[PDB]
């Protein structure tokens, strides 16, 4: 019960099967995780994942919905054999627009 095996998708479609720590909180993992998917795509001959302007990196379900950054991977209902996605989500902050009539 100390680890869970899940498949991580990366940009444009490589899946890598990974065995994660089941109780640390997810935000502790998403940065070093990105390091590994990039290291593997670079040797395999693909183009790596990169950021564009303003946004954040998230680890999400295959449905795209991100996991709560503060809870443990066992506290979320993620089991051995599930799969996940490492993804860039853009910044939505912008000025407000007002029309008087």
């Amino acid at each position: 019960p100390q680890a869970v095996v899940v498949g991580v998708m990366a940009g444009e479609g490589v899946q890598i099967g990974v065995l994660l720590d089941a109780n640390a909180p997810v935000s502790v993992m998403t940065d070093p995780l990105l390091k590994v998917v990039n290291s593997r795509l670079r040797e395999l001959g693909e183009a790596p994942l990169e950021a564009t302007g303003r946004g954040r990196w998230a680890l999400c379900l295959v449905d795209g919905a991100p996991l709560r950054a503060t809870q443990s991977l066992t506290e979320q209902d993620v089991y051995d054999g599930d799969r996940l996605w490492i993804r860039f989500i853009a910044d939505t902050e912008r000025r407000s627009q007002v029309i008087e009539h």
Binding site: A51, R54, G55, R56, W57, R94, R95
Partner: peptide, 19 residues
């Protein structure tokens, strides 16, 4: 033009790490 200019210099704090 002013929104684009000021955000481009002063982002929201949670976006800073990815950058």
């Amino acid at each position: 033009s002013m929104d684009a200019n000021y955000r481009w210099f002063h982002p929201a704090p949670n976006t800073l790490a990815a950058a």
